[PDB]
C-alpha cells in the first residue's frame, strides 16, 4: 500500500457513476486531465527532456528524414506549395534538423510551411523558442500560434490534425507519436463464445494491490461490438488484443488528406508487424512500475500495431495505400546514412567527436539498438512510389 492520491480518488468517483471504464478513457485521463494529467503539469523529471528519442540521438536521423522529404516532394512533381506536418514534435528537435539540413534544395525550402500538432502547452513553448525567430522581448507563447524561422520558414501552431489546411499537398511526419496514444483492450472468454473488454474499476477488495484495478466486462461493451471485425476469428480462451482506435482514426485522416490534395506520411515508432497482444506499460523515474500504481505520476506508452494501420488504409478503397513496416535501420540504410555517417565524420577532425557521431549511428541501425524494435510505415498514393521502401513486403490477403 501507499495513502490515496487526490487523482485516484477521482477516477474511483467515475467509476461509482459512470461504471468501470474503457482502457482509452483511463489513458486520455491519466495523461491529459488538466488538474491531475502527466503530459500536461508533470514538471521536473530526472535529466533534461525526460527519454532518448531518434532525433536527439543524432543529427543523422534527422537530416535522412530531411532527404526523405526532398525526395519525396521530387517524386510528387516538386509541387509549388508543400505543407510539412508533424505529430507530436516533441522539443522540436526533428524538425529543426529537417529545416537546418534541407535549406541547400533551394526549390524545395521556397515551397515548404511548417505545421505542428500538439495538444501540450509546454511543448509549444518549447517548440516555439527552439524554431522561431524572435523580435520581441515579452513573448506571450499563448497568442503566439504562427512564427518565422530564422531562414524565414512559417511555422503554424495547431491543436489537431482536423485544423490543418486542406487543398495542398502535405507531408505528414510522426515519430514517436502512435506509442504514446490512447488504446482499448479486448479479451476472448470461451465461456461467453465472445470477446469482452478490459476496463479499470475501483479496487475495494479487502487485499486488492492499488485503488483501481483491472476487470472485464460482463459482456461485449458497445465498443467490443463496434470492433469486432478488427478483431481475431479465432477465440482461443483468455486471448488478448490492444487495439490503437485513435491511431486507426487519424491514419485514415491521413490518407483521406492524401486522397484529395496529394501527400505522403512517414510513421516512426516501435512496433510490431502484427497485432500486439500485450504492451501498454508505464515508466516512472526511468524505472518500469505498475500501470495503477499512482496513476498520473507514469508516462504510459504502448507498442505499435503497424499490421492494422496499413489494413485500415487500404480498406478505405480509395487512392491512397500504405506500405510497410520495415525496420528502421534498414530505412535509414536505404536513405543513404552510412554515406552522411562518412562525410560529416571527416568534416570533424575530434575523434572524440567522431567517436560519439558512430555511436549516435549505432543507437538507430543496430538490431540490438532501435534498429528492429523500430520501425517506419508509409501512407501515400499508388501511384507515387515510396522512398525507402524497397524491403517492404507483400501482403496477398490484403490486396484482393
Ligand atoms: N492527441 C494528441 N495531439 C497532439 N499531440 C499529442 C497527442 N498525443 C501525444 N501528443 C504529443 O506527442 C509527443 C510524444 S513524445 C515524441 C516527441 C518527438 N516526436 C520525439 O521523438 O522527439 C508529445 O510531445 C505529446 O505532446
Given at each position: 500500500k501507499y495513502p490515496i492520491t487526490d487523482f485516484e480518488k477521482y477516477l474511483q468517483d467515475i467509476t461509482k457513476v459512470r461504471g468501470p471504464m474503457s482502457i482509452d478513457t483511463f489513458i486520455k485521463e491519466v495523461l491529459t486531465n488538466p488538474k491531475y494529467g502527466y503530459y500536461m503539469n508533470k514538471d521536473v523529471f530526472g535529466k533534461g527532456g525526460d527519454f532518448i528519442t531518434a532525433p536527439?540521438?543524432?543529427?543523422?536521423?534527422?537530416?535522412?528524414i530531411g532527404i526523405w522529404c526532398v525526395a519525396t516532394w521530387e517524386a510528387m512533381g516538386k509541387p509549388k506549395k508543400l505543407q510539412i506536418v508533424e505529430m507530436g514534435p516533441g522539443r522540436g528537435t526533428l524538425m529543426?534538423?529537417?529545416?537546418?539540413?534541407?535549406?541547400?534544395?533551394?526549390?524545395?525550402?521556397?515551397s515548404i510551411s511548417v505545421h505542428l500538432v500538439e495538444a501540450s502547452p509546454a511543448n509549444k513553448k518549447t517548440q516555439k523558442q527552439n524554431l522561431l525567430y524572435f523580435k520581441d522581448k515579452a513573448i506571450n507563447f499563448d497568442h503566439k500560434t504562427i512564427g518565422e524561422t530564422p531562414n524565414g520558414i512559417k511555422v503554424t501552431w495547431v491543436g489537431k490534425l482536423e485544423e490543418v489546411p486542406t487543398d495542398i499537398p502535405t507531408l505528414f511526419?510522426?515519430?514517436?507519436?502512435?506509442?504514446?496514444?490512447?488504446?482499448?483492450?479486448?479479451?476472448?472468454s470461451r465461456e461467453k463464445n465472445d470477446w469482452c473488454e478490459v476496463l479499470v474499476d475501483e479496487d475495494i477488495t479487502e487485499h486488492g494491490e492499488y485503488y483501481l484495478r483491472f476487470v472485464q466486462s460482463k459482456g461485449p461493451t458497445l465498443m467490443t461490438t463496434a470492433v469486432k471485425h478488427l478483431l481475431?476469428?479465432?477465440?482461443?480462451?483468455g486471448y488478448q488484443v490492444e487495439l490503437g482506435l485513435a491511431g486507426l482514426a487519424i491514419s485514415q485522416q491521413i490518407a483521406n488528406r492524401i486522397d484529395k490534395s496529394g501527400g505522403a506520411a512517414l510513421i516512426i515508432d516501435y512496433g510490431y508487424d502484427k497485432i500486439v497482444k500485450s504492451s501498454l506499460q508505464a515508466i516512472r523515474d526511468h524505472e518500469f512500475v505498475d500501470i495503477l500504481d499512482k496513476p498520473g505520476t507514469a508516462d504510459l506508452s504502448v507498442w505499435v500495431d503497424f499490421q492494422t494501420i496499413?489494413?485500415?488504409?487500404?480498406?478505405?478503397?480509395?487512392?491512397?495505400?500504405?506500405?510497410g513496416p520495415v525496420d528502421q535501420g534498414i530505412f535509414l540504410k536505404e536513405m543513404g546514412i552510412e554515406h552522411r555517417l562518412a562525410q560529416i565524420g571527416r568534416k570533424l577532425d575530434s575523434n572524440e567527436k567522431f567517436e560519439e557521431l558512430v555511436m549516435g549511428y549505432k543507437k538507430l541501425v543496430d538490431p540490438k539498438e532501435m534498429g528492429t524494435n523500430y520501425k517506419v510505415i508509409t501512407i501515400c498514393d499508388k501511384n507515387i512510389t515510396p522512398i525507402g521502401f524497397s524491403t517492404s513486403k507483400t501482403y496477398d490477403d490484403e490486396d484482393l
Amino acid at each position: 500500500k501507499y495513502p490515496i492520491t487526490d487523482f485516484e480518488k477521482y477516477l474511483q468517483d467515475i467509476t461509482k457513476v459512470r461504471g468501470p471504464m474503457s482502457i482509452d478513457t483511463f489513458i486520455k485521463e491519466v495523461l491529459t486531465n488538466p488538474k491531475y494529467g502527466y503530459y500536461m503539469n508533470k514538471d521536473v523529471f530526472g535529466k533534461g527532456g525526460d527519454f532518448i528519442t531518434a532525433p536527439e540521438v543524432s543529427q543523422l536521423f534527422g537530416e535522412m528524414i530531411g532527404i526523405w522529404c526532398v525526395a519525396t516532394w521530387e517524386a510528387m512533381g516538386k509541387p509549388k506549395k508543400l505543407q510539412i506536418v508533424e505529430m507530436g514534435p516533441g522539443r522540436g528537435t526533428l524538425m529543426k534538423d529537417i529545416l537546418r539540413s534541407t535549406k541547400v534544395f533551394k526549390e524545395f525550402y521556397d515551397s515548404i510551411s511548417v505545421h505542428l500538432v500538439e495538444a501540450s502547452p509546454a511543448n509549444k513553448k518549447t517548440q516555439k523558442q527552439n524554431l522561431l525567430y524572435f523580435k520581441d522581448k515579452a513573448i506571450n507563447f499563448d497568442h503566439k500560434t504562427i512564427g518565422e524561422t530564422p531562414n524565414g520558414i512559417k511555422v503554424t501552431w495547431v491543436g489537431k490534425l482536423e485544423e490543418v489546411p486542406t487543398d495542398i499537398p502535405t507531408l505528414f511526419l510522426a515519430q514517436e507519436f502512435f506509442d504514446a496514444l490512447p488504446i482499448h483492450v479486448f479479451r476472448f472468454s470461451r465461456e461467453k463464445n465472445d470477446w469482452c473488454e478490459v476496463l479499470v474499476d475501483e479496487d475495494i477488495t479487502e487485499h486488492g494491490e492499488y485503488y483501481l484495478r483491472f476487470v472485464q466486462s460482463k459482456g461485449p461493451t458497445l465498443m467490443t461490438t463496434a470492433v469486432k471485425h478488427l478483431l481475431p476469428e479465432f477465440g482461443l480462451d483468455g486471448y488478448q488484443v490492444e487495439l490503437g482506435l485513435a491511431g486507426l482514426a487519424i491514419s485514415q485522416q491521413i490518407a483521406n488528406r492524401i486522397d484529395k490534395s496529394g501527400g505522403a506520411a512517414l510513421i516512426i515508432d516501435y512496433g510490431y508487424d502484427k497485432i500486439v497482444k500485450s504492451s501498454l506499460q508505464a515508466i516512472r523515474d526511468h524505472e518500469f512500475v505498475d500501470i495503477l500504481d499512482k496513476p498520473g505520476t507514469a508516462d504510459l506508452s504502448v507498442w505499435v500495431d503497424f499490421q492494422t494501420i496499413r489494413k485500415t488504409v487500404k480498406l478505405l478503397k480509395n487512392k491512397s495505400t500504405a506500405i510497410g513496416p520495415v525496420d528502421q535501420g534498414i530505412f535509414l540504410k536505404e536513405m543513404g546514412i552510412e554515406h552522411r555517417l562518412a562525410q560529416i565524420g571527416r568534416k570533424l577532425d575530434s575523434n572524440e567527436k567522431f567517436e560519439e557521431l558512430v555511436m549516435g549511428y549505432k543507437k538507430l541501425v543496430d538490431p540490438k539498438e532501435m534498429g528492429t524494435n523500430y520501425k517506419v510505415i508509409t501512407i501515400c498514393d499508388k501511384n507515387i512510389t515510396p522512398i525507402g521502401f524497397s524491403t517492404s513486403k507483400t501482403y496477398d490477403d490484403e490486396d484482393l
